[PDB]
Symmetry: C4
Subunit: 171 residues, 4 copies
């Protein structure tokens, strides 16, 4: 506190994209210490274009980026690509029924990358696909922000903040 | 904490340039919650060199760098260029002739880049152009400074300060 | 501001790898200030797989990386390699008999690097080896995290914290300015 | 808790090098506000080896690095070089008599860079030189530390700390 809601947004012709960090989670140990129990992540929210300058957020779709997936974006070269597959029932007998795939490839010309989100839900025959292009400059804001936030998503800031004034085994 | 006026300055033959960050804007919400309403930015100030290599900040021109524009600067290569156009009259009011254009291009000798600002407005028949060279070493100080300030202009620091036990 | 234990983990087919930062040490003086007496480091822990996504931490092998060694990791190119050798007192009047060797080299496919830890003890007959591939993506996470902790491991965060409000080569000559004029 | 002395050292064959940040200066304003009056810097200290595993810090040479000079180091490629000249009498009567020159150039096998500090004082016939190799690894530690300390040497941290919830000028 005071809790603040933030998020970088890229608004384009066919769609809009919002990016926001989500807190990691901790669990109690002895002596009043804590353990990082769940890594934080970055949440992406895609929305299709509505009626000029506005978007239909009621038709939005979300996709998360874990620390490792953020590693793929920050190490993505000018003409490289990466794909992420999310299925809540992987391995389960009913896998492949509801899933999301995020693909990041370079634009034809070479002025940036496409962020293409595919959502499938066989239970209701849904098969949405939203894509938005992000310029090299906009990609750079993302890389700077991801680099800043990753240590916090791993909770390393809580660990080093105790590295204040107030090799151990025969290997 | 108190108020501190920082600002990295570059002083050259025909002009000087000062760089300062500018705070994001927040909007009050419900139960002790806040929401960022306006991103922060970096303010660039250009001043013509008067005499004895001093500068008349009386006729200084300023240019605002939004977060996305800052991204253009930090991902700019050795031989790359970028240009920013700012027109107060986006097209809602009138066409508008009052315009500001910032240009960043590699120097001839390839020792860095140069920053060039164009200001013009029909209202007072103004037509200025302040140019200033930035060495590779000074460019690196900007990149480093811009990379650090970036998440703060977005307000992500206020968010991560809550990423802790409890 | 309670004590918190963290650590980035990479889970693979044959082994798992956890990476964790370790605090520097300080030693008091007299002027009401402190002095950095030992740099922090990053501890790597390797564990062999004992089941699907299950690892035996009872047979874990540990390897500490100093700030300089962390320097070799973050500056590694796609086709570069580096080797680290640890032994309780290299030379000395008694080297010992046990050693640890960590190798980091590119994968055949070129999709990343592998981390290989070798542990040899002649005081028994123990000769362990643990291998683990690290994708390009996972390596970037280590690079980002390592770049972040370096300053804290050097203690520069406590120094820089006093850089709050209350260039003439005049600090390079011990103030012995009587030699700057005749 | 308050002041603490840090510093990254590099111990080599016939010389050692200690790097350390130095705080910037602020000045009060009648408005009750402060203004950065002087940028912080990074201090380098070269010491020759006093034997084998020893270094005589009695005869150590200090060289200051401004934020712009730090900028030259962090943007130094694996084949580029940089050089800095410091004269305590610059702008005055007899400049060009006393100086310190720091040169940073790539090692032959392209495995790092060497820092070469030259100390000259013609008035007393002084002419010293201290050479030290810095591996690609140790150099990366410097770049990482330098990129971290930079915004603080500029005072930008005291600025962003007040960016709490509690084209414009164009």
């Amino acid at each position: 506190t005071p809790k603040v809601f933030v998020g970088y947004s890229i608004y384009k012709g066919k769609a809009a994209l919002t990016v926001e960090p989500r807190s990691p989670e901790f669990s109690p140990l002895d002596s009043g210490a804590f353990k990082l129990s769940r890594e934080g992540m970055v949440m992406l929210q895609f929305a299709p274009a509505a009626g000029v300058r506005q978007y239909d957020w009621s038709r939005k779709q979300v996709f998360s980026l874990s620390v490792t997936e953020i590693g793929s974006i920050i190490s993505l070269g000018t003409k490289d690509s990466c794909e992420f597959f999310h299925d809540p029932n992987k391995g389960r007998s009913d896998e492949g029924r509801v899933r999301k795939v995020l693909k990041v490839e370079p634009l034809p010309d070479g002025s940036g990358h496409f962020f293409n989100l595919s959502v499938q839900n066989k239970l209701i025959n849904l098969d949405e696909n939203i894509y938005i292009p992000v310029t090299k400059a906009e990609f750079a804001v993302l890389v700077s922000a991801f680099n800043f936030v990753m240590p916090y998503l791993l909770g390393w800031h809580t660990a080093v903040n105790s590295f204040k004034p107030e090799g151990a085994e025969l290997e």
